[PDB]
């Protein structure tokens, strides 16, 4: 550029990939879950993947991702929703937390028990 | 036009070396001559002459040792908008000491070696190797 430029203005910079406005700047929110659907994934693989429609207890409505040895969800029973990157399906931003509210853990685990939910003690 | 003395003097010399010229000519001034008066002291030139009275021209003869080249870098680095000003220790050690810096001081145009010996600082005009 020419040596007199960049007067009375700073440089513009880029935003750090913020994408989850229904969370109100919080790490998580509650949602009731209303419908479940199936979506065709990208790149050639013998696979199909699932999504759920979620109304949030803060007046929003979005589509969220589901997995962890399949799904356990049911209408209006209440679950948690947070940000999670995919990749796994196109056009999606949100993820479902396991071992919390109506959402189950993973049945019978011997390692990695601090991830994706594990059964409660007794007996 | 003669709008800038340094964007003339250094450019004529740097391009004159790419032409393998023994000597190069320019419109003369007491600033261009004060720089030649340092280049001769540090051994870069073997001669310079000023001729023309009321339209004076400066012609300086580069001191070659064997075949080609006499300057391994000849840059201004400073700008007319904001010039490079340095305090009495802040004088640059050009090409890690294989070159020199030329300084404008209240005691005239001199080397960073001579400015440091005089306890002076000022404005940098040339960075030379």
């Amino acid at each position: 550029a020419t040596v007199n430029q960049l007067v009375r203005k700073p440089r513009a910079r880029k935003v750090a990939k913020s994408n989850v406005p229904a969370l109100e700047a919080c790490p998580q929110k509650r949602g009731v879950c209303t419908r479940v659907y199936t979506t065709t994934p990208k790149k050639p693989n013998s696979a199909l993947r699932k999504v759920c429609r979620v109304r949030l207890t803060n007046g929003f409505e979005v589509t969220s991702y589901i997995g962890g040895e399949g799904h356990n969800l049911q209408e209006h029973s209440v679950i948690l929703i947070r940000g999670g990157r995919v990749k796994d399906l196109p056009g999606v931003r949100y993820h479902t937390v396991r071992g919390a509210l109506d959402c189950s853990g993973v049945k019978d685990r011997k390692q990695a028990r601090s991830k994706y939910g594990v059964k409660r003690p007794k007996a | 036009s003669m709008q800038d003395p340094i964007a003339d003097m250094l450019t004529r010399i740097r391009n004159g070396q790419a032409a393998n010229k023994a000597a190069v000519t320019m419109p003369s001034s007491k600033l261009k001559v004060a720089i030649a008066n340092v280049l001769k002291e540090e051994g870069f030139i073997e001669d310079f002459k000023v001729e023309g009275d009321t339209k004076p021209e400066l012609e300086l003869t580069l001191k070659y040792f064997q075949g080609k080249a006499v300057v391994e870098s000849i840059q201004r680095v400073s700008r007319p908008g904001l010039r490079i000003y340095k305090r009495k220790d802040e004088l640059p050690k050009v090409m890690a000491g294989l070159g020199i810096a030329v300084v404008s001081t209240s005691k005239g145009v001199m080397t960073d070696r001579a400015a440091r010996q005089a306890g002076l600082g000022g404005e940098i005009i040339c960075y030379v190797a």
């Binding site: - | 051994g43 870069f44 001191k63 040792f65 090409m95 890690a96 000491g97 190797a129």
Partner: protein
């Protein structure tokens, strides 16, 4: 007297049918650990041939490094396309300083008291051409009857 080293190996990309080609590329270096270096690139079928074409190129060239106080005689620029390399001297009793891939070339030249910046492509087969453009741009005077230094 003599130091030898392997820097890089890569298979040729080409899908040729059907399958891929069996050609490989290699990059090796030779030096003395005292002030000299040479380099070689080679292309042939499978690594045990490609590495030998690279060694036989590296064993056919040798350039001197200009040294003073055990470090570079001056800071120097050397360029090949996207590899815009600048090499500069370091402090007394030093070696890290050098790391990454530049360590592999300075290890056969013998001088880890040298700092580098690539200002673009660090691609090993191309940056090695820019460093030796810098070694051809090293000054050895041949000027001490008029100019200061040494």
């Amino acid at each position: 007297e003599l130091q030898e080293k392997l820097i890089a190996v890569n298979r040729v990309s080409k899908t040729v049918k059907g399958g891929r080609i069996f050609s490989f590329t290699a990059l090796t270096v030779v030096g003395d650990g005292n002030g000299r270096v040479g380099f070689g690139y080679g292309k042939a079928r499978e690594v045990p041939a490609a590495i030998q074409k690279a060694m036989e190129k590296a064993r056919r060239n040798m350039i001197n490094v200009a040294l003073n106080n055990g470090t570079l005689q001056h800071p120097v620029k050397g360029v090949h396309t996207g590899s815009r390399v600048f090499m500069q001297p370091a402090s007394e009793g030093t070696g890290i300083i050098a790391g990454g891939a530049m360590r592999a070339v300075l290890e056969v030249a013998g001088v880890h008291n040298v700092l580098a910046k690539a200002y673009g492509s660090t691609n090993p087969i191309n940056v090695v051409r820019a460093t030796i453009d810098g070694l051809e741009n090293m000054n050895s005077p041949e000027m001490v009857a008029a100019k200061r230094g040494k």
